[PDB]
Symmetry: D3
């Protein structure tokens, strides 16, 4: 009863003072979109951050929808190898599913509870200018971010709108490219000198094995990739968080999307429920 | 030859003065979107409107792109008789082709010439609130406009952005509805009391016994649907035109979208090249 | 653990949205200044309301300090009866203790935790214009509020300062008058169309005997004074709350000052911990 | 023809974009001030410049009206030698025709076609601070420019007014000095860092053996005054042009004041109708 | 003496408070324009009015300089009858002395003592729109005032400039009309709803049999023109005074242009040195 | 007599111009607060400064009022030798007489004449942060200024309020300290880099062999404390004056507070009536 209330609020409220007016870039990866209750709490968390004066910016990935469409549209995966190739027709379907399907569902859910969210993509006012990714050879319209023009995002958050961004970039050649969501969300936070970058994943956070490491610095994060503690798909995430932070972002939080109110618990408590990467005061 | 340059300018410059800062809602139909040459001159015209200080707003349709998706997807039409029926799955493909492909091609083009266009749709910040169009029975997720919330538009145009709108509204329930681009375009123009509403068709304008009618008062226009001179799809148009004019829109122009620079010739010349409907005045 | 956090925050946060930017007038009566821990929590509550965007305004009464000074200064209570008389020399000592002693201690405590509080009184920019109270005959410089000039309060809260007001008013004759704190705090909230008026007392709130009545309307409050449920010193308080509310104040909360974080618990929970008086929506 | 309208506009509209808000200083010479149809066109071009968002500033000359005023006043054009002379009696008359007669003739016309013109001279607010001319002994009160105070001009054009300026300078001793309009116009231009200075002469411009010279640069222009292409009174002008260009002015234009609508053709077409002097930088 | 300073200031400083930011229109008549020491004082008072925060506007007359210009130009003051006449030739000369000579003499002086003066006439921005005078047959181009457009004046005084206005009116036909300075000054006053109109005459003001009249009201003043106290040319002036007062002007002042520092003494002392006409309202 | 009125105004008006919008920190001592007649003329002067557009700030002392409270309270002095000692209880009575009585009498007076005064003290929003003055040993809660936080002052004067400051600062610990009004007044003036710092004393100014010294540069002033010409309490003053001037204060004036209208005579006359210390200049 009562005391739980006092202590939660005394722990929380301060954070309302510090984050009021700041920008949080939140990456909707896989997980937090699977189980229904986790999906509901998430939508709710965003609305709360908005009630407290925070400017949330959402970034989402692809998923089931894309593989399905490709099949239902009788199209097979093409490879050069380092991976799958993305030919014109495939890019058109990806952009169609991401923008016309996933992006707008999130916008509907949010606008169903007061979020005033408007969906857009890298093409809009050239938010994300991209270029051909060539490390594995010409494998299609796979891109790397060349520049971020955040004016549109400032115009939106400045008028109380929550951007919902689909990872599709525009190249000078006018063509469109697919972009890794984590990277796009990180590049978008760097260009805004955003307070936080929140990456939702399928785990509690970085585990120094059997245990969750609550805090880390960019240097301590890399060291764990070098000494082999960090492996799998978790490597590219942490590597993304390290870059974001060294690029001007206040802090990056890696947390479990399958955890109900993971976002609410990570931001309004002092201990959190995931891993936070950040430079020391110094 | 000098003589020409002088005459065209003495006649255009005055319009640049009176239209500065004004808003023009333009409905982009099928013809001007079909021939690369009318389409190239169209983008060119929006850009010139922007350079003269006019605030354009674009609302586009769909057509071929949608049907093709239907066929490539094995989705079979359904009747609940009165006509076609936008069902659950049909809507999703419509929303996906309008938002994810058509909308973004227009945004790309404009942004390839300094238009600073951002493409949204009826769902974003609930710009277009719709409810199931019940007159022709239960034909599915076909809707009529309950209300237009123009805030996002104002935010975008005041910040020098060109909104490219997809005709898909949202219902209080939360389901997306397909709306007639002409009505949509006419409704938002009313909501903003725009200076002009421009409808690009495939015909020169409103014809009577093979003769283009230059001018029309709303009344004269009702007596042409009444008189039987206006028929077929042109009825819904003239209908929107009259509604728009009485609702506060300065004037609506029904011109031939297949005519190169139709917009330029209609706006910056005294006689015009199509039909303009407006009240009497001094 | 956890869930307590989620439910407290989900119950609280909404209120941050509604009260942000609003003004709360808080009356520091007797009680909440007695036991030390209650005094500490109170100071803390004010700072929190400030962290959340609320504009608190404090009003305090007299107490032990005044009786003491009168004795230490060898002065005896004079009566005409309806009460104690307030002769020039007595008024001078009251104003000295209230302004020079009580008022500034509160300011120090607050400014010890970030409150940016500045103490002032009814004399300042003629905040409280008063006049001779004559219902019991000329008994000295006892006053009734004749007018409130809240400009000074707007200048302060508008610049992030928390006013701490001592109940001393100025009369046109230039002389100063003592004013009942509850009345002054109520008159000050009315003149500001303040969202809330919070009266701290020595009880849980209005008790329909053995039980605490959580909510009431101005009419239901008076009825309880007529039917004799409300008696004692609690009559003038409720009567004060009724007036304030009928004068334009969002709502008045009567709560226990001896209760730790009474303010925090009353404003960030839906049930509260005292009595709230307010007109119905209608 | 519809192709003339398209072409003329596709050329002009872009200049409209880049000249919007800029300032043009224009020297109203003797030529265009003569033939009723050359004069009509000029007053019109000035207005159209205003309609497109440009801020025009006009500097006029004298000559005829003055000479006739000397002689009518029983005074014969006095000399001493180096040219004429402007003794105290001759000056006062000069200032009377330039400011009292001519300057008002120009304002009276513009203001019959919505010009919002207000005439002033170098004395008003000490716009043009001049010093007794020395390079030619003591030729009366003829003077040179020592300082320009555009404050008044700025104030005027920011309020949608068109400054019609008379070449009379004011000296530190309150005294008046006659000044060369072209050089006054060129000095005020530099003083504003205007976008353009237009000098209207009695001939197409700089003729390279009959053949007219379209564009040049400061360094080139001086070379034609050296080899002897620029002869006669076309030398004085070409220099101001240079002076101003190096003084910060965007570009200078020497056109046929006689050529009806010379201004219009020179500014909104890419080839102009006269000689343009400017620096190199695409 | 120290008591003189105290008294003079305790009187003046209050007027400084209430005249701060207000507008005063002042008619520079023939009197104060004559004796080098009367003239010196005037230019000084105007500056001091500016130093205290008042916005002065000056309207000058002509007379002498003109008459000498008629005759020097071989033209004798023509008549027909009802008084003089101002045929086309006579007007142009008039406009030349009022605007070209006189108006600049006043600006040249103020601007030697930090006045920031800029001279203009009724033509500039169509300040004074006049109609051919009719009450006296056809006496040339003498005219009456039909409309004032203070826009220019406002623009000027808001930028810390002092308008020096010449009485020449501009008619709907672009033509020029001579106008009575006093009435021009009174019309512009009403047009601005100025705080004061100062008419400088050739005598202390309105003399009630030698004895000077301090204050009056509109209704009273007219009565002295009826019984015959106000005789001679002191009738025309007194009327403008009335006209303006009823026209909205705060008050009017008729003082001795001859009296050195008349303005200063009349405005900062409670008794004034001349006759003041105004409405009743403490 | 006219002759006087003119001379006083030609000499005062110029000062009204240069002091408009400037800030004057005035230290109100014992003399001007002792005689009802100097005190009446003092309030009158602050009001006139306000009416001329100057932003006065008042810092007052104490003296008699405090001692009397001491005696009427049976509080006995204490020495920790070097001099008197402000102990726990002594401070509380000092704070109570300065804040609760003296401060409020000045606020009342001013507000009785339109001064819109609000009285604060060093504690309010930590305007004056002090630490125990350790030079003369441990004499109690006597303090020296560690820092001045002028925000509240800026808020008050920008909103047309006259701050009446009590010389009681606050220490980081939280204990209140007694500070020298002269230093306090000199410190805040430095913090605001006020135009003037005015010290009202009981002597005409800085004297040398019975002669008042009109002007002084900081250097000339140090050589008078050094030379032995300045003695006693005047040392701390001249000391503050020099410090203030070098710290950014435009000039400090040391005048006789017992002289009626000392402030008026010093500010609005060229010669002044006391001593003005300022750097050399042009
Ligand atoms: C991997 C990454 O950057 N993004 C995810 C987002 C979708 C998800 O988590 O399922 C992706 O697959 O592209
Ligand atoms: C029908 C109508 O109102 N609009 C068209 C626009 C598409 C086009 O021109 O191809 C539509 O299909 O919705
Ligand atoms: C009664 C009331 O209005 N105020 C209280 C405030 C002090 C307190 O509660 O002790 C008072 O005694 O004047
Ligand atoms: C002052 C001056 O040089 N004036 C020139 C203006 C006309 C011109 O150059 O064509 C003049 O004829 O008197
Ligand atoms: C135009 C006009 O009436 N002028 C007057 C101005 C001087 C005056 O009235 O003293 C004139 O003498 O010509
Ligand atoms: C001493 C000094 O600096 N100030 C005086 C001011 C009081 C007065 O003039 O009576 C003081 O006692 O603190
Ligand atoms: N995993 C962690 N270390 N979490 C700490 C979170 C701290 C705080 N709520 C923030 O948002 O910064
Ligand atoms: N169809 C017409 N008759 N059009 C007339 C066009 C008038 C003007 N150019 C305009 O855009 O308003
Ligand atoms: N006693 C009560 N009824 N309390 C309800 C409080 C509700 C809410 N927290 C408010 O501040 O309005
Ligand atoms: N003579 C010329 N070079 N004319 C070209 C001028 C082109 C265009 N009017 C401009 O101001 O830039
Ligand atoms: N003749 C007079 N009545 N003069 C009184 C003028 C007083 C003061 N100068 C004012 O403008 O109000
Ligand atoms: N003591 C002096 N000599 N004072 C000169 C005063 C100068 C001017 N009046 C001022 O206030 O700055
Ligand atoms: K633009
Ligand atoms: K004021």
């Amino acid at each position: 009863m009562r005391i739980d209330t006092v202590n939660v609020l005394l722990e929380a409220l301060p954070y309302i003072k510090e984050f009021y007016g700041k920008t949080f870039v939140i990456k909707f990866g896989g997980s937090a979109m699977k189980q229904e209750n986790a999906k509901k709490a998430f939508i709710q968390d965003i609305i709360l951050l908005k009630y407290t004066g925070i400017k949330p910016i959402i970034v989402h990935g692809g998923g089931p929808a894309i593989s399905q469409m490709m099949k239902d549209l009788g199209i097979e995966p093409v490879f050069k190898n380092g991976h799958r190739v993305t030919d014109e027709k495939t890019m058109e379907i990806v952009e169609m599913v991401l923008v016309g399907k996933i992006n707008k569902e999130i916008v509907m859910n949010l606008n169903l509870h007061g979020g005033r969210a408007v969906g857009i993509c890298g093409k809009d006012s050239k938010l994300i200018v991209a270029e051909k990714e060539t490390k594995h050879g010409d494998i299609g319209y796979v891109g790397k971010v060349k520049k971020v023009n955040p004016e549109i995002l400032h115009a939106l958050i400045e008028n109380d709108y929550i951007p919902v961004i689909a990872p599709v970039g525009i190249g000078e050649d006018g063509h469109s490219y697919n972009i890794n969501a984590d990277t796009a969300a990180a590049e978008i936070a760097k260009s805004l000198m955003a307070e936080k970058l929140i990456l939702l994943t399928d785990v509690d956070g970085v585990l120094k094995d059997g245990k969750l490491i609550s805090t880390l610095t960019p240097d301590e994060a890399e060291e764990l990739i070098r000494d082999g503690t960090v492996t799998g798909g978790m490597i590219p995430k942490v590597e993304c968080a390290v870059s974001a932070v060294r690029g001007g972002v206040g802090a990056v939080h890696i947390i479990n999307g399958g955890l109900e109110h993971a976002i609410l618990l990570e931001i309004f408590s002092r201990k959190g429920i995931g891993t936070m990467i950040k430079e020391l005061e110094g």
